[PDB]
Amino acid sequence: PITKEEKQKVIQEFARFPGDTGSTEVQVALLTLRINRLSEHLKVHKKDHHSHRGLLMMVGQRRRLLRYLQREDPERYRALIEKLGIRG
Amino acid sequence: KRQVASGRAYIHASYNNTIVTITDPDGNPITWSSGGVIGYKGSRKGTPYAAQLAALDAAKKAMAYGMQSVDVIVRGTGAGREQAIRALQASGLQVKSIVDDTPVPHNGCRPKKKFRK
Amino acid sequence: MRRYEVNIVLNPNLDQSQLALEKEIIQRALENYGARVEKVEELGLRRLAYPIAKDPQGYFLWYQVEMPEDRVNDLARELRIRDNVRRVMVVKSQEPFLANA
Amino acid sequence: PSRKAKVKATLGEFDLRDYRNVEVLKRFLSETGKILPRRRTGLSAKEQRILAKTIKRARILGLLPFTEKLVRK
RNA sequence: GUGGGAGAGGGUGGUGGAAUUCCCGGAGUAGCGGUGAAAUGCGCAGAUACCGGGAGGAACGCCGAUGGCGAAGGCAGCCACCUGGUCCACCCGUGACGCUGAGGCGCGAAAGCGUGGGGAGCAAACCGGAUUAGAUACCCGGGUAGUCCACGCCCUAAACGAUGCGCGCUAGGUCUCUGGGUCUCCUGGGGGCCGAAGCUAACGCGUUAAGCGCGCCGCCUGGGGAGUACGGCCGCAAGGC
Ligand SMILES: NC[C@@H]1O[C@H](O[C@H]2[C@@H](O)[C@H](O[C@@H]3[C@@H](O)[C@H](N)C[C@H](N)[C@H]3O[C@H]3O[C@H](CO)[C@@H](O)[C@H](O)[C@H]3N)O[C@@H]2CO)[C@H](N)[C@@H](O)[C@@H]1O
Ligand SMILES: NC[C@@H]1O[C@H](O[C@H]2[C@@H](O)[C@H](O[C@@H]3[C@@H](O)[C@H](N)C[C@H](N)[C@H]3O[C@H]3O[C@H](CO)[C@@H](O)[C@H](O)[C@H]3N)O[C@@H]2CO)[C@H](N)[C@@H](O)[C@@H]1O
Ligand SMILES: NC[C@@H]1O[C@H](O[C@H]2[C@@H](O)[C@H](O[C@@H]3[C@@H](O)[C@H](N)C[C@H](N)[C@H]3O[C@H]3O[C@H](CO)[C@@H](O)[C@H](O)[C@H]3N)O[C@@H]2CO)[C@H](N)[C@@H](O)[C@@H]1O
Ligand SMILES: NC[C@@H]1O[C@H](O[C@H]2[C@@H](O)[C@H](O[C@@H]3[C@@H](O)[C@H](N)C[C@H](N)[C@H]3O[C@H]3O[C@H](CO)[C@@H](O)[C@H](O)[C@H]3N)O[C@@H]2CO)[C@H](N)[C@@H](O)[C@@H]1O
Ligand SMILES: [Mg+2]
Ligand SMILES: [Mg+2]
Ligand SMILES: [Mg+2]
Ligand SMILES: [Mg+2]
Ligand SMILES: [Mg+2]
Ligand SMILES: [Mg+2]
Ligand SMILES: [Mg+2]
Ligand SMILES: [Mg+2]
Ligand SMILES: [Mg+2]
Ligand SMILES: [Mg+2]
Ligand SMILES: [Mg+2]
Ligand SMILES: [Mg+2]
Ligand SMILES: [Mg+2]
Ligand SMILES: [Mg+2]
Ligand SMILES: [Mg+2]
Ligand SMILES: [Mg+2]
Ligand SMILES: [Mg+2]
Ligand SMILES: [Mg+2]
Ligand SMILES: [Mg+2]
Ligand SMILES: [Mg+2]
Ligand SMILES: [Mg+2]
Ligand SMILES: [Mg+2]
Ligand SMILES: [Mg+2]
Ligand SMILES: [Mg+2]
Ligand SMILES: [Mg+2]
Ligand SMILES: [Mg+2]
Ligand SMILES: [Mg+2]
Ligand SMILES: [Mg+2]
Ligand SMILES: [Mg+2]
Ligand SMILES: [Mg+2]
Ligand SMILES: [Mg+2]
Ligand SMILES: [Mg+2]
Ligand SMILES: [Mg+2]
Ligand SMILES: [Mg+2]
Ligand SMILES: [Mg+2]
Ligand SMILES: [Mg+2]
Ligand SMILES: [Mg+2]
Ligand SMILES: [Mg+2]
Ligand SMILES: [Mg+2]
Ligand SMILES: [Mg+2]
Ligand SMILES: [Mg+2]
Ligand SMILES: [Mg+2]
Ligand SMILES: [Mg+2]
Ligand SMILES: [Mg+2]
Ligand SMILES: [Mg+2]
Ligand SMILES: [Mg+2]
Ligand SMILES: [Mg+2]
Ligand SMILES: [Mg+2]
Ligand SMILES: [Mg+2]
Ligand SMILES: [Mg+2]
Numbered sequence: 066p067i068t069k070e071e072k073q074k075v076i077q078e079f080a081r082f083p084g085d086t087g088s089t090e091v092q093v094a095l096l097t098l099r100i101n102r103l104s105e106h107l108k109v110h111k112k113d114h115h116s117h118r119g120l121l122m123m124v125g126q127r128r129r130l131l132r133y134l135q136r137e138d139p140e141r142y143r144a145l146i147e148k149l150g151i152r153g
Numbered sequence: 154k155r156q157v158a159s160g161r162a163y164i165h166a167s168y169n170n171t172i173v174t175i176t177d178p179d180g181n182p183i184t185w186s187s188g189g190v191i192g193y194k195g196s197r198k199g200t201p202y203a204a205q206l207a208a209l210d211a212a213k214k215a216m217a218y219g220m221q222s223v224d225v226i227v228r229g230t231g232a233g234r235e236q237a238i239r240a241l242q243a244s245g246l247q248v249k250s251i252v253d254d255t256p257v258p259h260n261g262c263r264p265k266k267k268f269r270k
Numbered sequence: 271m272r273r274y275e276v277n278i279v280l281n282p283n284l285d286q287s288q289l290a291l292e293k294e295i296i297q298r299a300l301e302n303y304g305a306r307v308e309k310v311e312e313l314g315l316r317r318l319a320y321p322i323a324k325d326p327q328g329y330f331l332w333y334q335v336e337m338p339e340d341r342v343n344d345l346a347r348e349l350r351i352r353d354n355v356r357r358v359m360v361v362k363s364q365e366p367f368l369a370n371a
Numbered sequence: 372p373s374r375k376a377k378v379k380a381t382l383g384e385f386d387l388r389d390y391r392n393v394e395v396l397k398r399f400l401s402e403t404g405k406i407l408p409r410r411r412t413g414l415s416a417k418e419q420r421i422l423a424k425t426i427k428r429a430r431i432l433g434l435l436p437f438t439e440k441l442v443r444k
Numbered sequence: 445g446u447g448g449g450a451g452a453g454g455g456u457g458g459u460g461g462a463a464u465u466c467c468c469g470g471a472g473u474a475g476c477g478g479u480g481a482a483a484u485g486c487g488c489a490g491a492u493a494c495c496g497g498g499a500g501g502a503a504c505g506c507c508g509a510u511g512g513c514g515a516a517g518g519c520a521g522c523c524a525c526c527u528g529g530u531c532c533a534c535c536c537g538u539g540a541c542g543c544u545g546a547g548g549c550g551c552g553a554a555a556g557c558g559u560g561g562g563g564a565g566c567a568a569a570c571c572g573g574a575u576u577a578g579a580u581a582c583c584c585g586g587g588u589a590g591u592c593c594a595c596g597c598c599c600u601a602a603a604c605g606a607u608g609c610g611c612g613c614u615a616g617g618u619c620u621c622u623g624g625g626u627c628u629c630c631u632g633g634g635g636g637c638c639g640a641a642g643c644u645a646a647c648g649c650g651u652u653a654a655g656c657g658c659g660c661c662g663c664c665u666g667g668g669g670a671g672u673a674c675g676g677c678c679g680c681a682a683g684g685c
Contacts, residue, residue, distance in 0.1 A: 066527085072445090076445075081537095081538085084536080084537070085537060085538080086446080086537040086538085087445060087536090087537035087538045087539095088537065088538045088539095089538060089539095089541075090538090091445085091537080091538080092538075092541095095445095102527090103527070106455085106526060106527055106528095107455090107527085109456080109526085110454085110456070110526070110527075111455090112455055112456090113454050113455040113456090113526090113527065113528080114454075114455090114550085115454040115455085115514075115528055115529085115551090116453095116454060116455075116527050116528045116529095117454095117528085117550080118514095118529085118550090118551080119454095119527080119528040119529065120528085121549095122528090123528095129541070130541070132541085133540090133541040134541085136541085137541085161495095163493065163494060164493095165493055165494090167477095169476095169477070169478065169479085170476080170478095172476085172493045173493080174472085174492095174493040174494050175494090176471080176472090176494055176495075177471080179470095179494095179495065179496095180471085180494050180495035180496085181471035181472075181494070182471055182472040182493075182494050183471085183472075184472075184473090185472070185473075185474095185492090185493055185494085186493095187474090187475075187476080187493080189474080189475055189476075190473090190475075195479085195481070195482075196478090226494095227444065228493095250442065250443075251444045252441060252442055252444065253440070253444045254440055256462075256464095257462075257463075258462060258463035258464075258503080258504085258505070259437075259462040259463070259503080259505040259506090260462090260463085260504050260505055261462075261463050261501095261502065261503045261504065261505095261565085262463060262464045262465090262502070262503070262566085263464095263502085263565055263566045263567090264566075265565090265566070265567090266566080267583095269566090274524085277432060279433060316434075318433040318434070319433060319434060319436035319437075320436060320437070320461080322433045328433055332391070339524080339525065339526095340525070342523095342524055343457065343458065343523085343524050343525060344524095346458080346523080346524075347457090347458075350458095357431075357432060357433060357460095358459090359428065359432060359459090359523065360523070360524065361390075361428070361523070362523090362524080364388055366389070367386060367387045367388045367421055368384055368385065368386060368387070369379060369382075369384070369387055369415075369418050370379060370382060370383055370384045370385070371384040399507095400506090401506080403506080404505095404506075405505080406506050406507045407506085407507085408506085408507070408508080408509090409509090412507095416512095416620090416621065416622090417622085419507070419508095420507080420511095420512095422507080423506090423507045423508090424522085426507080427521065427522055430460080430461075430521090430522085431460050431522055433460095436461095437460085437461045437462065437505090437506090437521095438462065438505085438506090
């Protein structure tokens with residue numbers, strides 16, 4: 066699954082300032098983690114459609130968050146994309 | 154020709170018949186009777202009366218092997234399972250016990266349309 | 271890593287050398303799959319509700335253990351190979367749940 | 372009917388997850404191997420639901436019967 | 445975000461017992477089976493009933509509910525791994541990041557199709573026995589596809605709550621599943637029943653609205669002709685839109 070240490074690791078890694086949990090950068094980091102993990106699972110288990118729905122939703126949420134970021138702060142957005150390796 | 158004297162009475166009661174098989178304590182048949190073994194032929198084999206006769210018959214035949222006591226095992230629901238048991242009870246055989254062994258599935262095998270619903 | 275309970279039911283007909291031999295392969299394969307043993311209850315042979323491989327009784331071992339999760343199924347697979355090994359059940363440990371407490 | 376007693380009322384405290392306690396578990400099975408309903412076990416939903424699984428484990432282990440012959444009759 | 449919880453939610457690999465069928469063996473003999481009554485059928489190459497051993501396939505009794513989960517179709521032995529959703533508490537972080545959603549994409553019961561397996565039980569078609577005025581049926585005996593698996597198609601339905609999704613507002617009572625709290629009580633989430641106001645042609649609905657409101661989507665416009673014809677698109681086909 067995802068252990069508290071892996072999670073906290075990426076939370077600190079992407080947090081805007083100390084104590085930052087729910088900022089856009091962090092949320093997108095977390096979501097990217099879960100996506101990579103879940104699409105990894107669905108690499109095998111191509112027959113698990115129910116989980117694929119999950120994936121769809123997670124991607125949708127992520128894409129919304131990024132849309133908002135790129136609207137507000139094109140810098141923070143560019144940074145995020147590069148750092149995580151998304152969108153290209 | 155054995156001289157057994159203690160054994161098992163298996164009553165197999167269906168809606169079409171009753172078959173009373175009597176065996177030695179290891180389950181090997183000694184004698185058996187049924188609805189059709191007495192004169193009854195058609196539907197009449199499924200009668201409680203036919204069951205009484207089949208019981209009494211198997212028990213006579215079995216006492217001729219010198220049997221005294223039996224353990225009764227009842228398989229199936231059907232008219233005259235109980236009549237069979239009772240005929241056995243005073244057949245002039247001591248019935249030491251009665252047990253309902255009726256096999257039922259943990260749901261493995263699809264029934265004929267007759268039995269589905 | 272996660273903590274499981276291992277149940278093994280063995281042949282009641284084992285003499286001392288046979289039984290302790292089996293336990294030896296148990297231990298060695300447990301280690302070989304990376305299972306550290308936290309606790310053990312050997313409850314000896316006991317009566318069964320039904321015959322297991324023609325036998326009216328069985329010999330029960332229990333192990334509380336910590337091991338890698340990716341290894342569990344494969345461990346139990348290996349455990350089962352032994353002929354004298356009749357039953358194997360590996361269970362994720364859980365905190366006891368009481369009624370009338 | 373079922374006014375005899377409730378199986379939980381007899382017992383003291385005990386671990387409903389404990390698949391090895393045979394004597395306690397046996398109390399929750401009928402004359403046949405069948406798991407008693409709650410109207411008998413006098414358990415709660417969650418409880419009963421746990422009981423069932425642990426009984427099933429005990430059955431696989433050979434400690435409890437899946438089924439049993441009915442005596443008397 | 446942190447910390448708790450319930451669950452037939454999903455995928456993979458394991459594995460357990462009951463039963464059916466079959467094969468072997470023992471013991472046993474004159475029938476079994478089946479129906480309204482029967483006959484076909486099975487049985488002296490020894491059936492049925494009984495015990496022991498084996499093989500395989502399929503489905504998981506009790507628990508089991510008026511229950512739970514899932515967007516829907518749907519999901520039920522037990523075990524492990526992998527994985528989706530969700531609820532409660534703390535009030536910690538971001539700061540309108542929201543709702544809906546043509547087209548697109550994906551999922552989609554059963555039956556059906558392709559390749560290759562599998563095939564115990566059941567069983568369209570089919571072969572028979574009855575019933576009947578007839579009986580291309582109901583009932584009885586057999587029985588192929590199929591039902592099972594893998595992979596790829598099909599895209600339908602009384603796919604139903606026949607009730608689009610989101611949010612706010614408008615008495616209570618009662619049962620239940622599942623959280624939390626100063627645990628008789630108070631406070632969330634879910635499933636039922638009776639009912640205030642109100643609505644409804646009526647039946648009924650009524651904080652799980654079919655009440656009062658706002659947003660966005662889909663649809664309707666007398667019955668037959670007809671889900672037909674034509675055209676297009678999809679499909680191996682059946683056929684679908
Ligand atoms: N692949 C598994 C599935 O098997 C299905 O097969 C199942 C269906 O044909 C049928 O389901 C019926 C259902 O129609 C009806 N509404 C109620 C009935 N209790 C169900 O049956 C089921 O009930 C329970 C739970 O599984 C079990 O105890 C029972 O063994 C099972 N037959 O019983 C079968 C065995 O469960 C279908 N082929 C399909 O859904 C799918 O392929
Ligand atoms: N047992 C593992 C299961 O396998 C399922 O799929 C597998 C099982 O259905 C089946 O495995 C074996 C089969 O190889 C072998 N030829 C026969 C055996 N009876 C099967 O097992 C299964 O078959 C069916 C399920 O359809 C059940 O009736 C039966 O109880 C069950 N043991 O064949 C499939 C491929 O191995 C699913 N992955 C999931 O339910 C689960 O992991
Ligand atoms: N769902 C499968 C089964 O669920 C049970 O265990 C599952 C649930 O009890 C448990 O629920 C936990 C919850 O306790 C905890 N407070 C939060 C957690 N997110 C939940 O887990 C849930 O969400 C995550 C995604 O984060 C999913 O990966 C997971 O499948 C889902 N159950 O997560 C477990 C994993 O799914 C059964 N006891 C077990 O046999 C089996 O894992
Ligand atoms: N594998 C061959 C044998 O198939 C048998 O069963 C197979 C055949 O009896 C059956 O025939 C199917 C038919 O059902 C279905 N309605 C249509 C399908 N095209 C047919 O298939 C047939 O025809 C085609 C070409 O015409 C061939 O390529 C194919 O090999 C042949 N089976 O399809 C089955 C497989 O799905 C035995 N059960 C199996 O044990 C055995 O192995
Ligand atoms: Mg967890
Ligand atoms: Mg959402
Ligand atoms: Mg700006
Ligand atoms: Mg008859
Ligand atoms: Mg295992
Ligand atoms: Mg599941
Ligand atoms: Mg068998
Ligand atoms: Mg034989
Ligand atoms: Mg003949
Ligand atoms: Mg022959
Ligand atoms: Mg023998
Ligand atoms: Mg046998
Ligand atoms: Mg629902
Ligand atoms: Mg339904
Ligand atoms: Mg705040
Ligand atoms: Mg909050
Ligand atoms: Mg601020
Ligand atoms: Mg939407
Ligand atoms: Mg797309
Ligand atoms: Mg489909
Ligand atoms: Mg199908
Ligand atoms: Mg096919
Ligand atoms: Mg099959
Ligand atoms: Mg048939
Ligand atoms: Mg006919
Ligand atoms: Mg007529
Ligand atoms: Mg006709
Ligand atoms: Mg005719
Ligand atoms: Mg025939
Ligand atoms: Mg037929
Ligand atoms: Mg569509
Ligand atoms: Mg409906
Ligand atoms: Mg409703
Ligand atoms: Mg509903
Ligand atoms: Mg939404
Ligand atoms: Mg409490
Ligand atoms: Mg529901
Ligand atoms: Mg009124
Ligand atoms: Mg009115
Ligand atoms: Mg009405
Ligand atoms: Mg009402
Ligand atoms: Mg409520
Ligand atoms: Mg329309
Ligand atoms: Mg339309
Ligand atoms: Mg018109
Ligand atoms: Mg017109
Ligand atoms: Mg049509
Ligand atoms: Mg056309
Ligand atoms: Mg074409
Ligand atoms: Mg055409």
